[PDB]
Design an enzyme around this catalytic site. Structure first.
Site, mmCIF file in Angstrom:
data_model
loop_
_atom_site.group_PDB
_atom_site.id
_atom_site.type_symbol
_atom_site.label_atom_id
_atom_site.label_comp_id
_atom_site.label_asym_id
_atom_site.label_seq_id
_atom_site.Cartn_x
_atom_site.Cartn_y
_atom_site.Cartn_z
ATOM 1 N N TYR A 44 31.590 -15.944 -44.507
ATOM 2 C CA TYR A 44 31.206 -15.372 -45.794
ATOM 3 C C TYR A 44 30.584 -13.997 -45.598
ATOM 4 O O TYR A 44 31.092 -12.999 -46.111
ATOM 5 C CB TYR A 44 30.211 -16.273 -46.528
ATOM 6 C CG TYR A 44 29.814 -15.716 -47.878
ATOM 7 C CD1 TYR A 44 30.768 -15.530 -48.882
ATOM 8 C CD2 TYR A 44 28.499 -15.335 -48.141
ATOM 9 C CE1 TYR A 44 30.419 -14.971 -50.121
ATOM 10 C CE2 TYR A 44 28.140 -14.778 -49.376
ATOM 11 C CZ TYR A 44 29.105 -14.597 -50.361
ATOM 12 O OH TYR A 44 28.764 -14.033 -51.574
ATOM 13 N N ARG A 101 15.752 -13.928 -47.725
ATOM 14 C CA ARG A 101 14.678 -13.397 -48.560
ATOM 15 C C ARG A 101 14.787 -13.793 -50.026
ATOM 16 O O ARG A 101 13.776 -14.048 -50.686
ATOM 17 C CB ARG A 101 14.631 -11.871 -48.477
ATOM 18 C CG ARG A 101 13.462 -11.283 -49.248
ATOM 19 C CD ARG A 101 13.899 -10.256 -50.281
ATOM 20 N NE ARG A 101 14.160 -8.951 -49.687
ATOM 21 C CZ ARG A 101 15.329 -8.320 -49.748
ATOM 22 N NH1 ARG A 101 16.356 -8.875 -50.381
ATOM 23 N NH2 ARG A 101 15.473 -7.131 -49.171
ATOM 24 N N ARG A 149 23.031 -20.057 -57.739
ATOM 25 C CA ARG A 149 23.850 -19.653 -56.603
ATOM 26 C C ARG A 149 23.276 -20.133 -55.272
ATOM 27 O O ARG A 149 22.094 -19.951 -54.992
ATOM 28 C CB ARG A 149 23.994 -18.131 -56.572
ATOM 29 C CG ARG A 149 24.605 -17.512 -57.825
ATOM 30 C CD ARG A 149 24.743 -16.002 -57.668
ATOM 31 N NE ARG A 149 23.474 -15.393 -57.268
ATOM 32 C CZ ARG A 149 22.428 -15.224 -58.073
ATOM 33 N NH1 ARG A 149 22.489 -15.608 -59.342
ATOM 34 N NH2 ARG A 149 21.309 -14.684 -57.605
ATOM 35 N N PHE A 174 21.342 6.831 -41.675
ATOM 36 C CA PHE A 174 21.998 5.933 -42.606
ATOM 37 C C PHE A 174 22.110 4.528 -42.037
ATOM 38 O O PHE A 174 21.860 3.554 -42.731
ATOM 39 C CB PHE A 174 23.390 6.474 -42.938
ATOM 40 C CG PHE A 174 24.228 5.547 -43.772
ATOM 41 C CD1 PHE A 174 23.855 5.221 -45.073
ATOM 42 C CD2 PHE A 174 25.408 5.016 -43.259
ATOM 43 C CE1 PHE A 174 24.643 4.382 -45.853
ATOM 44 C CE2 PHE A 174 26.208 4.174 -44.030
ATOM 45 C CZ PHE A 174 25.825 3.857 -45.331
#
Ligand SMILES: N#CSCCOc1ccc(Oc2ccccc2)cc1
Ligand SMILES: N#CSCCOc1ccc(Oc2ccccc2)cc1
Lengths: 334, 334, 334, 334, 334, 334
Positions: free
Chosen positions: F136, F183, F193, F253
């Site tokens: 997933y 978290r 969900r 980044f």
């Protein structure tokens, strides 16, 4: 564009030989900085060599040479040498010296100054101990290496560390100088100049000139081999100096002369020719032709290959056979 | 993994033994683009070279060549040259051409359209003025450099400046071209062909063919030297051009030919052999053999080294002696 | 200043004549890692080649060699091979081996282990098929290429990918063996050892030794050319492998050998001397000598050049003419 | 991979609040080297701090600690300090010490030999003279800086100079040691110790402990102000030593402690709470609020900000106030 | 190590704060160059600021300020401004100014010449048009942006473009001056000074001083927002300017004050505190507390956040709301 | 200066709370590419998440998302999710996406395709096993990492190796997903969900929602710990991946997200306030506030510090301890 600058590069190619091309390849300001630097060195070098200049007249010349860089109309017309033209038209060279940024002027003047005191000091004495061979080599070559490093950092093309490490810079010089003093034994003999350390050759012959008598050739090659063993000890520093460089044009300028010096010592090792004329540089092992002296790892492989050239040819009976292996082993291991 | 693209690379090694390797070594898109470019340039040249094709059939062929690249079925089965397989199976080559990105297609076609036009003017004429020499060379060499540069930039492996400066790009081609023209004098004479600018060889004899007569060697070697001096003037742009290259594959592709060209020129300068067969390119000093054309600085060094190789050989008695010194002197100080 | 390590480099120069200089040129910790790796590898190889050791006695040695690396007093005193000193003074080598970082030790022992296993399993059988030929080659060269890669990645000098892609690493070593094998046919013949795959020469003659017979020489070359065709299939991988390297000293170490290998295959191709003497390495186009195997584009170029030397010598009259071309064609279009 | 090493790091984290993170961030081989260097230094310091150890018994252990690094089974189970784990399981640490390359080994041991000698020497005595304060700091802080500097250069990650210049290496340690000693006055006063140079505080009181009493803090914050002025003298050397660094991980490892050191001296200068508990570092001004110590220019800026945070609080009323402004004005002009 | 240079830096840390640290952190030549530049600039600033100097007298001083640099004895003794010390001891600074390289003096005196012409030109007026605001700022800050830039290019620590592009070097000085003018509104009003562009504030109140009155607050905040939006326009040039810098010490000197400025605009935006006291720039955040201003990408990230911070705080009803967005949108997407 | 582009960056700041600033900091073409890549990904995600959509109308949309990027008039005015603007105004985004170089479009489209297929594959099922939880995470974050890595190499701001290493690129994504997944236990539960993997919590409670019940707070924490421990197993790949980056903007980044994740993991480790509200990041030790996450050694310090905070709080009680220790000590020695 300058007519004088054009002229300085005409002399660079007259006086020089194998350096003019790599110097002209230098990036930016180093190009001119180094060109003028070699020109003044060539001039001061000529003043020392000129034997038609009494010592009492030569000492003042050597000491104050550096001050002439600032005397527009200074020049010497009494030279008898072959490269005397840089002296006779020195004002042309001075002119461009004073066009260099002053950060380069300072280094150049300073080196000429210390070199002058050094050349004068040896004017009336031959080299004795090996310790002095290093001293004399430090004055005519070491300082040049120290000078160049300082001009590299000055220009910002090389790290400031390059120029600060004077010991190793000094080694770059000592290596090229001893190698040259060794190759040119015969040229300097049938010339009246004695450079081989006396505390060394005096252990083989009565006079350094005796090494030109085919009757003492065996003793001569033992001395050659001892001196060569000596020069080799500078290789480690050499490799350390080069390993620090980051500018391609500089690397090339620095790495090449050293690799030819190494090939030269290799060609001369336990080689009788040294005392009969000229010893021709040749070729060692495939890889030497495979890779060229333009990158650090390659310069190492090239050097190690020459090292083996000598190693494989070490006579067990040579008075210095063991020390020759010692330094060679140290070099290839660490 | 097209069979046509494999066919293309087969034809390349067949009709480009010299540059084939380095071309295949180019990065990404530059590769195929430069491969096709050489195949279509090969083809066009094959038609030009072909003496059995009447001017009546040849002119439209040269003029319309660039349009054949979009005609899927065009082909020329009437050639009698040796590399003609590129013409008989042009559909394969053109298929890969229309396969490239529109941007490359643009450059190549444009060069073919201009090269064809130019090749057409000179079908019935010889080179007269030195101006017509730069005209012809531009048509068969400069354009190649202008096209190659435009491809390098098009791909973005090199900055736009490379493709913009058509003058520098042109010089890259003129140097190589003028050089081969000078070296091939003899075999071109033994082939009923002339390329040496008449306005120059005419001042020495009545026919370009006289230089092959032992009785005129002196005049021959004076014209040779002149033309060489001419060629030397392109060196600055070559150095400038090569200096701007950022990509290694492209540098290799571009630098080597030029070095080969300078060496060839240094070898022919003041050499009577140029008129007795093919001349021998002699080694190079030690500072060269410890370097190769893979980094810019070294390339300058090799070049500067060959120009000095020439300067040493310039005889006061030569009519060009003074211009030769001059231009070399200029390349030395920039 | 370890004297064992000095001795180790003495041996490296005694045993790996060639690689020695490029090995010593390796950066930081790869140097001692690779040096020691070559020494223990050479020892192992020497036990396996020594034929005065019965099979029954040899396997337990090949099998436990990887563990003797940890037996401080272990040494072999009964070998009669030329490089037996690495075995008689092995304690010195394992000493410095146990001094490498534990992560390098892990790698080296794993390869020696897996290698002994492979070597043992081939003492009772000759190579039959090509599949078997790749298996033997994996065991004596492929794993070395894998070992060297895992070392490069572990030292962090190269990308983690270098050591992960074992198939490519495998090819670097296979290309080498197959080469040295194809070239050492004769010497390995008069030695009682046969390495050419039975399935290839079996359909050319009855006895591999036959090719040494000056009569079926034309039968030999055909085979020689069929095997070389076998080898060439590895190039695509060598190039892919070399194109990932980023550390200059490492590239030098890897490209050079591969390049000499291909040069050798070129020399040997369709050469009858492979079966009569020592085929020496010929020169490469003026464009090959202009470069060096130090950057990726140059290597690709040099290789492509050597590809051509083979490609336009392939006789139609050869049983492998079509495969020799499909592969060289595939190489030109990667 | 080995448990022994994993344990060392477990100990690196149990003994070093902050430092373990930055050491673990060191590149390649200097990571393990410093982690081990810090553990033995810790174990040595533990022995030196444990009061439940007879002087007649402790002197030998300190003079002999360096040698236990070669004794696999050595260990000390009779300490009652917080970090005795490194003493009870020293065999684990010593094992990994002998797995480090010989070159790091000679450095670490040599410094333990020398350190342990000075440590033993200041057992029976106290810091008297100021230059005796420098001598103490050298034995427990200077040498560590000198050690680390030698490891950095030995690993080639830093320049040879970094290791050679033992003077600057030393100052690096002296600065951190004096700042730490000054800051921990009260702490070191209830523990029963006195590092403050007697020849300094004696001028202000009769017993170092006097500074703790409220009716004295005006002679305490004059003595304290006089020491800081001394320590401040090290900065020029700290900038020089930090300026030679080129590796980021090593720069972070070196620059941070030193910066944290100044900040401390600027929070304790002419402050009273120094003698009434510990002191806190509450933020650095705006410029130092936008830049961290990762680049040299930043570090300088930061350092200068703290010099001025001190230059402002210099009461003309203070006795050292003069030379205090003098040293500060010097650190900023050069 | 001159006491004159020592004192120059004493005043540096005395007048400039947000610059003293970073100035002193400048590489080589530009350190002393920039130091002195900031000293004369402060001296000139002190004059154009002393209200106890009737005009008639002032104009001259400003006009002939650049000339006092070459007049060894010049100095002003009648200043009643805290900084006067730089005028009363101006000789010391003129002394050290003349010690600088010529090309640096060229820049300093040229700016001081123009700067004075503009300052005097505004002695008799207030900023009316927005254009007049832009060029008032040009005479007291833009030119200082240009000055420094030219000093950066002269030292060659930065490309020539930096000193060439006056517009960009202009936006650099205009961003700060405006940021300070906007923030220093109240203080200035109480100092009897006005810098806000009249054609802007006049649309809100009859006098600039009305923003000090509690009743006018709301309107004062909208004007504050119109001016803030005005200054946001120089940001694209700021980012552009910083993008071109290559020297770290220079980047620090330039990025810091600019990032400090944005921070302040972000703090003052729509903040009515700007008219009651001083605003405490609310520190970074989750992503800007992860970075500092020592590398462009970081600075950008920092700039962009403060932009969004202003953006998400814009009230629809705000007269300028539509432009504050238009511009912020430009900066994001560019 | 493009209107639709300005809109895209307006949607980037709306959807992306933070990354927005660093994304806009990327160099050259990556700026728009990643921004755009971020926007389409925000769209395709908004779909899946939408629970007011069928499951037979959602699949094709997901399965075909990538296709819509080439359908100018595509849009989805039917979503009821927070970021529906990206769906309802999709044409503005697709237009710009179609502006990106072909190489960029290639990648992004491909990622969206592969992604959708995975997203569509999971609404039917739930994350059962870990090897599936990786599946997933792979589909919703690992692929994004791969995509970004490819755009990085494609842009040529990073070596091709960066994009070629998909495995560590995947870990980058997985480490984050597993972080936000952990978290956001409540938020994801108070949304109906479930993302946590069965096999883990299953062996703890029946109702995965039980952890929201104050009667098994422990069992909730131990599972939490168990999962974190699973996550920490990705750090090595993260540290390695970041170690490969050469571009500053690209590093900032990549590094920052990762640093915040690890911040969160340590923030939530063995913390019950996770099943009762939002847990937010605390502060870092001394060393960190001196380290912005912009250079690798710094980032390492930070990670190693958080690894330590967790280590210190591992209960001997918790079942998954030992593993937490086992993995953490492994990170200590990288
Ligand atoms: N005239 C005269 S004296 C010229 C010969 O003496 C030299 C020459 C070079 C040098 O340093 C170099 C450093 C690196 C590479 C090459 C040179 C030092 C002394
Ligand atoms: N002793 C013994 S056995 C030596 C021959 O076996 C090899 C040799 C090299 C190698 O990989 C290299 C990769 C690139 C270039 C050179 C080597 C792998 C296997």
């Amino acid at each position: 564009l300058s007519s004088s600058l054009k002229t300085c590069y005409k002399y660079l190619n007259q006086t020089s030989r194998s350096f003019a091309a790599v110097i002209q390849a230098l990036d930016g300001e180093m190009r001119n900085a180094v060109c003028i630097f070699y020109l003044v060195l060539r001039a001061l070098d000529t003043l020392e060599d000129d034997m038609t200049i009494s010592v009492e007249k030569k000492v003042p010349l050597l000491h104050n040479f550096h001050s002439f860089l600032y005397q527009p109309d200074w020049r010497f017309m009494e030279s008898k040498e072959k490269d005397r033209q840089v002296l006779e038209d020195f004002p042309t060279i001075s002119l461009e010296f004073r066009n260099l940024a002053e950060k380069y002027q300072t280094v150049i003047a300073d080196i000429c100054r210390r070199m002058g005191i050094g050349m004068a000091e040896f004017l009336d004495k031959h080299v004795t101990s090996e310790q002095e061979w290093d001293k004399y080599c430090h004055y005519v070559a070491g300082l040049v290496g120290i000078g160049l490093s300082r001009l590299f950092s000055a220009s910002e093309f090389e790290d400031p560390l390059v120029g600060e490490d004077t010991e190793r810079a000094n080694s770059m010089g000592l290596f090229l100088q001893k190698t040259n003093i060794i190759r040119d034994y015969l040229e300097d003999q049938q010339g009246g100049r004695e450079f081989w350390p006396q505390e060394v050759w005096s252990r083989y012959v009565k006079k350094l000139g005796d090494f030109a008598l085919p009757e003492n050739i065996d003793l001569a090659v033992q001395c050659l081999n001892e001196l060569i063993t000596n020069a080799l000890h500078h290789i480690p520093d050499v490799i350390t100096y080069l390993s620090r460089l980051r500018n391609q044009s500089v690397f090339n300028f620095c790495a090449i002369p050293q690799v030819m010096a190494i090939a030269t010592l290799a060609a001369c090792y336990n080689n009788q020719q040294v005392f009969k004329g000229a010893v021709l540089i040749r070729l060692g092992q495939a890889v030497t032709l495979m890779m060229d002296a333009t990158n650090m790892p390659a310069v190492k492989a090239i050097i190690y290959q020459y090292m083996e050239e000598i190693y494989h040819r070490i006579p067990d009976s040579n008075p210095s056979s063991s020390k020759t292996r010692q330094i060679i082993s140290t070099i290839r291991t660490q």
